[PDB]
Amino acid sequence: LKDYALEKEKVKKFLQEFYQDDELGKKQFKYGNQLVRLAHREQVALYVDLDDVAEDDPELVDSICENARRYAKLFADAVQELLPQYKEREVVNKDVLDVYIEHRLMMEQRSMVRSPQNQYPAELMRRFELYFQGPSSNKPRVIREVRADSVGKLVTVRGIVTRVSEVKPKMVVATYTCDQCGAETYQPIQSPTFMPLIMCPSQECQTNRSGGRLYLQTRGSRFIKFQEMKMQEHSDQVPVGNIPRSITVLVEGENTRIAQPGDHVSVTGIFLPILRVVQGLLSETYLEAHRIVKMNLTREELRQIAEEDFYEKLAASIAPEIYGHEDVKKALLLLLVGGVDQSKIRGNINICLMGDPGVAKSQLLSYIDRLAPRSQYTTGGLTAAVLRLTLEGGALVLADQGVCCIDEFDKMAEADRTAIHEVMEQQTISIAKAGILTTLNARCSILAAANPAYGRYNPRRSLEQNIQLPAALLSRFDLLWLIQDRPDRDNDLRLAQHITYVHQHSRQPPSQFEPLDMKLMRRYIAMCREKQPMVPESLADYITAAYVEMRREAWASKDATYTSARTLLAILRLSTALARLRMVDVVEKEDVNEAIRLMEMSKDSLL
Amino acid sequence: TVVLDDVELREAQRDYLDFLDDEEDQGIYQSKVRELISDNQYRLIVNVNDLRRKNEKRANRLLNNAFEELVAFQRALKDFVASIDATYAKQYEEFYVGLEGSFGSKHVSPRTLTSCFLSCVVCVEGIVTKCSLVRPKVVRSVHYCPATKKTIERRYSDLSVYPTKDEENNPLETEYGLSVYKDHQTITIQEMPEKAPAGQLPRSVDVILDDDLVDKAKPGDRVQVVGTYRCLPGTFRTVLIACNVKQM
Amino acid sequence: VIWGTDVNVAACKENFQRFLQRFIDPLYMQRLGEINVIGEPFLNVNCEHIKSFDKNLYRQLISYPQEVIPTFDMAVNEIFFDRYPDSILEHQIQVRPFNALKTKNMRNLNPEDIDQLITISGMVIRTSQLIPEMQEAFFQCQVCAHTTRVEMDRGRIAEPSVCGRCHTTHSMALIHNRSLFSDKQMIKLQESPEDMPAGQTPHTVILFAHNDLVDKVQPGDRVNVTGIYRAVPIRVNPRVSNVKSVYKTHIDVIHYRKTKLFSEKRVELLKELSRKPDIYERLASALAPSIYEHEDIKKGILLQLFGGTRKDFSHTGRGKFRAEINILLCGDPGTSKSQLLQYVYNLVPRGQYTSGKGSSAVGLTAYVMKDRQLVLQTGALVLSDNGICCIDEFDKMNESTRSVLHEVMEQQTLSIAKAGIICQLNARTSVLAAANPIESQWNPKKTTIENIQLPHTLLSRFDLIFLMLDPQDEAYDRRLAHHLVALYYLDMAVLKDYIAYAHSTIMPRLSEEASQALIEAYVDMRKIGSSVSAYPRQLESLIRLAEAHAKVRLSNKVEAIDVEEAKRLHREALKQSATD
Amino acid sequence: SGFDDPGIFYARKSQLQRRFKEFLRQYRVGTDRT
Amino acid sequence: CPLDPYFIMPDKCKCVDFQTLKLQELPDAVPHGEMPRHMQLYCDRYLCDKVVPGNRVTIMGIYSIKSYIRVLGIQVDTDGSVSPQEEEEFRRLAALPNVYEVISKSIAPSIFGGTDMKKAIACLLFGGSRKRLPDGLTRRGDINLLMLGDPGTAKSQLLKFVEKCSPIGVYTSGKGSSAAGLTASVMRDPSSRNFIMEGGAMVLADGGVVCIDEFDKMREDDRVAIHEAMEQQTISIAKAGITTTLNSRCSVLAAANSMPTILSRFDMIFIV
Numbered sequence A: 001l002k003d004y005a006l007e008k009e010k011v012k013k014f015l016q017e018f019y020q021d022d023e024l025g026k027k028q029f030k031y032g033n034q035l036v037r038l039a040h041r042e043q044v045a046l047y048v049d050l051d052d053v054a055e056d057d058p059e060l061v062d063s064i065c066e067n068a069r070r071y072a073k074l075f076a077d078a079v080q081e082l083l084p085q086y087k088e089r090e091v092v093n094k095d096v097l098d099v100y101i102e103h104r105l106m107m108e109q110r111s112m113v114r115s116p117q118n119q120y121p122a123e124l125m126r127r128f129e130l131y132f133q134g135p136s137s138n139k140p141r142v143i144r145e146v147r148a149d150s151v152g153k154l155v156t157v158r159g160i161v162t163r164v165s166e167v168k169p170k171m172v173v174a175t176y177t178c179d180q181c182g183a184e185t186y187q188p189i190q191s192p193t194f195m196p197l198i199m200c201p202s203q204e205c206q207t208n209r210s211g212g213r214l215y216l217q218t219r220g221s222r223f224i225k226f227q228e229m230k231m232q233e234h235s236d237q238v239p240v241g242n243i244p245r246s247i248t249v250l251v252e253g254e255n256t257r258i259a260q261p262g263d264h265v266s267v268t269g270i271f272l273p274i275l276r277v278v279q280g281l282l283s284e285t286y287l288e289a290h291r292i293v294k295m296n297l298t299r300e301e302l303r304q305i306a307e308e309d310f311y312e313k314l315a316a317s318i319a320p321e322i323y324g325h326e327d328v329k330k331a332l333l334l335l336l337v338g339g340v341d342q343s344k345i346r347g348n349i350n351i352c353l354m355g356d357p358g359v360a361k362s363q364l365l366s367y368i369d370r371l372a373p374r375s376q377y378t379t380g381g382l383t384a385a386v387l388r389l390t391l392e393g394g395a396l397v398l399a400d401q402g403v404c405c406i407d408e409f410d411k412m413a414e415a416d417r418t419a420i421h422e423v424m425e426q427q428t429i430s431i432a433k434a435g436i437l438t439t440l441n442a443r444c445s446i447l448a449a450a451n452p453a454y455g456r457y458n459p460r461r462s463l464e465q466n467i468q469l470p471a472a473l474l475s476r477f478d479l480l481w482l483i484q485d486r487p488d489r490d491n492d493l494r495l496a497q498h499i500t501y502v503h504q505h506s507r508q509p510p511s512q513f514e515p516l517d518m519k520l521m522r523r524y525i526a527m528c529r530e531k532q533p534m535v536p537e538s539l540a541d542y543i544t545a546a547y548v549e550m551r552r553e554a555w556a557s558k559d560a561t562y563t564s565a566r567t568l569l570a571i572l573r574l575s576t577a578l579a580r581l582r583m584v585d586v587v588e589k590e591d592v593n594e595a596i597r598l599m600e601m602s603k604d605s606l607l
Numbered sequence B: 001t002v003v004l005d006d007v008e009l010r011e012a013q014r015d016y017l018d019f020l021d022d023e024e025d026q027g028i029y030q031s032k033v034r035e036l037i038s039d040n041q042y043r044l045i046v047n048v049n050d051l052r053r054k055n056e057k058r059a060n061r062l063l064n065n066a067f068e069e070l071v072a073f074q075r076a077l078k079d080f081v082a083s084i085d086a087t088y089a090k091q092y093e094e095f096y097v098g099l100e101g102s103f104g105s106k107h108v109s110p111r112t113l114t115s116c117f118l119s120c121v122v123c124v125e126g127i128v129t130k131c132s133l134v135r136p137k138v139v140r141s142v143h144y145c146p147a148t149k150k151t152i153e154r155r156y157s158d159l160s161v162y163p164t165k166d167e168e169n170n171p172l173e174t175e176y177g178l179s180v181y182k183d184h185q186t187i188t189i190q191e192m193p194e195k196a197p198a199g200q201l202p203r204s205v206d207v208i209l210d211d212d213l214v215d216k217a218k219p220g221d222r223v224q225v226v227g228t229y230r231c232l233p234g235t236f237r238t239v240l241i242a243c244n245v246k247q248m
Numbered sequence C: 001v002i003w004g005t006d007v008n009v010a011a012c013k014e015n016f017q018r019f020l021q022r023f024i025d026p027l028y029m030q031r032l033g034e035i036n037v038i039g040e041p042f043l044n045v046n047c048e049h050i051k052s053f054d055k056n057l058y059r060q061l062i063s064y065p066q067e068v069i070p071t072f073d074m075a076v077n078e079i080f081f082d083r084y085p086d087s088i089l090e091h092q093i094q095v096r097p098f099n100a101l102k103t104k105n106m107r108n109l110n111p112e113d114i115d116q117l118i119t120i121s122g123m124v125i126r127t128s129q130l131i132p133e134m135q136e137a138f139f140q141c142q143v144c145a146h147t148t149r150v151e152m153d154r155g156r157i158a159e160p161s162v163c164g165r166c167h168t169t170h171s172m173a174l175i176h177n178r179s180l181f182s183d184k185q186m187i188k189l190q191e192s193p194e195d196m197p198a199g200q201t202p203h204t205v206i207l208f209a210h211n212d213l214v215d216k217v218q219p220g221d222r223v224n225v226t227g228i229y230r231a232v233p234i235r236v237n238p239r240v241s242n243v244k245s246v247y248k249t250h251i252d253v254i255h256y257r258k259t260k261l262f263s264e265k266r267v268e269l270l271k272e273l274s275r276k277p278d279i280y281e282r283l284a285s286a287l288a289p290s291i292y293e294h295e296d297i298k299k300g301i302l303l304q305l306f307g308g309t310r311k312d313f314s315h316t317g318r319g320k321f322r323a324e325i326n327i328l329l330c331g332d333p334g335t336s337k338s339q340l341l342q343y344v345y346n347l348v349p350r351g352q353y354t355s356g357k358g359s360s361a362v363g364l365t366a367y368v369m370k371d372r373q374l375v376l377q378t379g380a381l382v383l384s385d386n387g388i389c390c391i392d393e394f395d396k397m398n399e400s401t402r403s404v405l406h407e408v409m410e411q412q413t414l415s416i417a418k419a420g421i422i423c424q425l426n427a428r429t430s431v432l433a434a435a436n437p438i439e440s441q442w443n444p445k446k447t448t449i450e451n452i453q454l455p456h457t458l459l460s461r462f463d464l465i466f467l468m469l470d471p472q473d474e475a476y477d478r479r480l481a482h483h484l485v486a487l488y489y490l491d492m493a494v495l496k497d498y499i500a501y502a503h504s505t506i507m508p509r510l511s512e513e514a515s516q517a518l519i520e521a522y523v524d525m526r527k528i529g530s531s532v533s534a535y536p537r538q539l540e541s542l543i544r545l546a547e548a549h550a551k552v553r554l555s556n557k558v559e560a561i562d563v564e565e566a567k568r569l570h571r572e573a574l575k576q577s578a579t580d
Numbered sequence D: 001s002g003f004d005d006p007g008i009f010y011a012r013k014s015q016l017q018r019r020f021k022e023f024l025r026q027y028r029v030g031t032d033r034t
Numbered sequence E: 001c002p003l004d005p006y007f008i009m010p011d012k013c014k015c016v017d018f019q020t021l022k023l024q025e026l027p028d029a030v031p032h033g034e035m036p037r038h039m040q041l042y043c044d045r046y047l048c049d050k051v052v053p054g055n056r057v058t059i060m061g062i063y064s065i066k067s068y069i070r071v072l073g074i075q076v077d078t079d080g081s082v083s084p085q086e087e088e089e090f091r092r093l094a095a096l097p098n099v100y101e102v103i104s105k106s107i108a109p110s111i112f113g114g115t116d117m118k119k120a121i122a123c124l125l126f127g128g129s130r131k132r133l134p135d136g137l138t139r140r141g142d143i144n145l146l147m148l149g150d151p152g153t154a155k156s157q158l159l160k161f162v163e164k165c166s167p168i169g170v171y172t173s174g175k176g177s178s179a180a181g182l183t184a185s186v187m188r189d190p191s192s193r194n195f196i197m198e199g200g201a202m203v204l205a206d207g208g209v210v211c212i213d214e215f216d217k218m219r220e221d222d223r224v225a226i227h228e229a230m231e232q233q234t235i236s237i238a239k240a241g242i243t244t245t246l247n248s249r250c251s252v253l254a255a256a257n258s259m260p261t262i263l264s265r266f267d268m269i270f271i272v
């Protein structure tokens, strides 16, 4: 329906004649200058903005998007054609490949019509990589939305890298030499596997019939960097009833090494099939990578924020169906906002929950995971692994400054207990399947949940007498809250009344402040992440005064209450977290006092 | 296995229409087809050298490649006639192209018409000796199937063979009016007897005429024919398909 | 030139032969005499010499190493046929170039460098037996015993499938021992971890010593390997000829270099600040700035960083001396012990971090494991053969582990009876052990053995036992908090270079001042203990500490101040551990 | 992605062809005078 | 890949000109009293069509078997084609005054009943002169004799003798039964179903002598052709308008017993 030669000239015109006013309004042929760099071997990857083509030909952009692979080859060959024009210098023969290319060109020039076979592949006249970048108009597409309809097209998506293979050299063009005629033979490769050539199709051996047997030559052949990865749907993309879905992505050439597992990246590239036969052939799909980017209200809303009971109202909104435990609900809110990480400081707020089974514990985590903008749920895989040959990140990695809710925490494997210890220590996960301590940046807050063994908690039995965890690890947690099934006939009756209402209404009883929509909550959280409140040194005097006071109480306590500098630092995290809730960039004495109150209540929970 | 677009044929078909689009230029070919419309014939005559002037490359392609290039040209002709008049174009199933002018090496004689010119246009000159009767030749036979209430076609073109039963073995009754037939005649040319060495054997070349070209020749006529020299299915008999005949 | 290259056989050989005879630091012709006298026909070359002599030939060399090296051999052999024209050698001279391109970030390697010579620094992790690789297979007919051979059929061996004498069907079976073989020891080596910028994913590569340079390097050796980068296909199945489009890449080693510092400014700068009178105090306080109110502990670990001078007691028949210092920090949980180990391990070069539990990922031991090559996986102690192993929770350890720690502390080596054979893996590490009191806190009036429950022998092997406790002093809590909140809102690099240079260059030797001072200190301690008295192990600790303290001052000789401070810290450790 | 096949690109008979080629074009007849 | 059947596509099937010929051993080179052999000649490119039957030629080609020759070069005896001792004897022979009588007597002593017919046969063998007129036309140098009368007389032996004596002596009959016969013939070879031109005895004996038994019994088409043949030494075969002409400059010795218009054109005649 359209002559590619005609399209070839338009892009060549566009490349040679598109410019944009650079810094200080410098009229510059952006691609032309890159072409000058390319001819000098100063560039290899040539990323192409499609919006520049949209600047003068949006019709061409849609045609490009309608079949991205075709226009990629057109753009590549156009660059191959225009390179001698922008060539001005003969740079040094970078690597064997340039001089081998030059030697190949010399022999070709030493040759007049020529058969199509007796000519070098265009993909061997390379060492410039070409890619596109998706237009701003074409919005990023959810993975689940991308289906067989959109194959053969360029699209932009966003997700989380579950895993990346190591960089390896993928062959581009196999090169061989005839046994007898000594002629060079080429073989571009498309599929991930192929059969090596045997007999040379060169004219001389063809005529001579001398049994010229091709033998491959790695120096002759051309390779490219190549790694394999599987992105995953972002948490927000997946509805609550669904689960994330993976997409294999093939990164190659310069694009490699640009991502790690857990990176919330955005990829633009071509969605194409790979054949690793009922009513047609069935074939696995993948997304050939082109560009990779590692990503990061109304006035009445502000009036609501100005309310002194705002954070209290927000706390009530955290699992309102869960009657009681409002102080805990506040503590969960602090975890969701987290700290500041001023400079660094460990802004993560790891909270551990212990108590008898049947106390909303499991249900609380689920609400937090639903509320959390990015989260993981596990029971105890958790840590990374080296599958057989790819780094597969565990749910701890997939948190990545989200929250890794961990039910059944007491029954975790002791190896994992050591692993999370490192996470709370350095916010990193070191794993060695083959004795190779590969370290991954597992920044995240850990929300643990456990129960005492042998049924309900026994106050007569000390802490860690009813629970089988290292007491040191419990100290690592920013907060540790205990829940006890005290039979309180009135309060138990109040809970029973709450349950019956829910049965008779499928809703909690009408609270003082109604719970808010989770989206609104997350918007407030995102606004809170914007803030990084500071600690004035005047507050330090009162903070230290409070700290030594409670430390004295610990010395007074017959049982050591885990008071240490860890306890002070956690109090700092809570106070600045409260300052984020206030939308005030200075921590208040009120914020400090409330954090101490929660600290005291957590200690009082140990009663 | 169904062709979608031919860029070369697209361009070639376009270029012929551009060549036939003789309006800004001297208007000779526009006047010709207008005369062709008035005269009711369906075979334009064309000087090859003017085509060389407007496009040497296309003219070279035409002489070297006959069957494909003419088909594009006929397409351009039919559209061009449709442009000037749709209904007159619709009267005729097809239109034809007549070549003329100087043919440099392709202008040969039956003695010199070697096999090297196969699938090349040739402008033969000689004397007609054998003539065959006019016969109507079917090209597009149209059939109706009352069992299936279905109408089918079958072209023959260059290509028991006559279809009479549905694949379900239902009877097929032909549709004579719908089908396409064309008069068809065969003649034989020889070198002019005065300029013909006695030592050499006779070199007689067959010729195929169709449509209005059928009766434009008799035995003992000194005629120049321009056509496409083609083999035949089987050591293969070889014949010349006339594109235009003129009696010098 | 050979196709696709700029390589002339004669000119490259002549230029190389010119480089051999003509050189400015001529040493090549001298070691040729060493090879002629010794008869070892391998003439190793620093490629940087070729770079200095001729960068183009060096560039030409690296571009086509497999092709240029035979020219280099022909150059040297004819030189050997010129210099010492008559001699006897089991094979003519070879060359093993090295030290050419320090693109040693193996994590940063590209397909552009395929079949290009490179050198990289790394620690060999796993090795294997030399693979007997077939190169010519003798064959014998089952029917008529037809003797025949097939020679180097491109890795695989082409089966005859038909006899040659009786010409029956496939009856010629290979004869194994009659076949020809070569040695190819496979070696798996890890990228030098200190050299890596991030270290988030340490890199490993396979290496091969083909018929030469085989078994010369054992596991754990941090060396520079020089050889040709190489990549090959892998068949999708052994039976089918299809291959992957990706090539697994390895190295065919050519030379192993077993392994000045910085520039003049740094040696000038560290020597300048070494002259400061309070460099010992400043360096101690500068060490681990996030710590507060800890100076005796900082000084002791600082002396462990510098360590005592290496001492060769081979002539005395006394065995190797524990030149390294081992310090056990015992204190209540939450007293910054873990931070101290992490800070030192992060700061220290070629050090290791582990925990007393067997659940530690690295593992403090070495042992065999099958893929199914029963190959030895090393341990952190063996890995830190010259570095420092920061061991956390040393109190919580297995008795089998505790026996190993006693052995290496007694010997600075580890004996492992792998399969049946025994290997003594040297471990001259500095052990920074950290232990916590049993129960919630340290019970006062209970000895370290009571409150940590370890053998008296093993804990006695620790030259220093630093006891730290969190006092119940609200003023200390107040000052500590103000220090922390102050931190809430000298760089390590200069200190690291100071210690490395002191290790590299300065080797303190005893002075009779130090000798008499140490003897006076011990007998005074003996007299104090005459009424846990003094022991000659305490003298050895005082000996080692004075060496370290002298090394701190860069005096290059042990002075009385080294003895005096060493005795002071030794008494401080006694005072910290004093109980009676 | 395997859906397209790239085309392979690139006594002694060619020596004999060269011998004819040099013979036909380079064969000289006559003499210096002629 | 349908199985063995395949469809040829004539559009791309390039071809070249094609022609088959039959070459016979020379009458000089055949052994005495033996039939000359025949060989198929294959000429395809410009080499093809350069020749017509009846030309004395020398070919260069490739011996081949399916049994035939693939031709690669042709030389045609456009004009011309001897020890000094043989000449000297011939010079001596002409020096003999009675060479006429020696030739006349010496030719046919085996047969009996010859008187001055021997002399006529001699002069026929020498033949006259194939003169070129000043106008450029040519006159038949041949001389033709007719023998009429007794078949009992052994003139067949005389025909057998003289044809053996002649440098190019072809002996056949008016009922010779050859497909060409005495003169040319165009016939569709049904094996290939294509017209194959074939030369007759007259054209075969070009420049020589033809002995014709039962000359009265010539074929009808042969009777037509012999008119121009004796009168012009040329067989003209017509294909509609163009008519090829084959050269037969051969003397004719005819035998018969009892068409009459041809007898006017004979140079000489005698009764048995």
Ligand SMILES: Nc1ncnc2c1ncn2[C@@H]1O[C@H](COP(=O)(O)OP(=O)(O)OP(=O)(O)O)[C@@H](O)[C@H]1O
Binding pocket: A321, A322, A323, A324, A325, A356, A357, A358, A359, A360, A361, A362, A363, A450, A451, A495
């Ligand atoms: N304080 C509470 N307020 C409201 N509902 C509660 C409360 N405690 C428990 N429930 C209800 O208890 C029901 C069943 O127990 P639940 O799922 O909370 O157990 P759990 O605490 O997660 O136990 P475990 O950790 O032992 O599995 C849940 O449907 C939850 O609604």
Ligand SMILES: Nc1ncnc2c1ncn2[C@@H]1O[C@H](COP(=O)(O)OP(=O)(O)OP(=O)(O)O)[C@@H](O)[C@H]1O
Binding pocket: A472, A564, A565, A566, C290, C291, C292, C293, C294, C331, C332, C333, C334, C335, C336, C337, C338, C339, C340, C436, C480
């Ligand atoms: N004297 C001190 N000076 C400075 N910081 C201190 C001091 N004592 C404790 N801290 C701080 O207290 C926290 C102790 O954390 P860390 O995990 O290192 O303790 P630890 O005593 O080694 O613990 P454990 O024995 O339980 O593993 C760190 O913030 C450390 O900085």
Ligand SMILES: [Zn+2]
Binding pocket: A178, A179, A180, A181, A182, A183, A200, A202, A204, A205, A206, A212
């Ligand atoms: Zn070949």
Ligand SMILES: [Zn+2]
Binding pocket: C141, C142, C143, C144, C145, C146, C163, C164, C165, C166, C167, C168, C171
């Ligand atoms: Zn045998």
Ligand SMILES: [Zn+2]
Binding pocket: E001, E002, E003
């Ligand atoms: Zn088929």
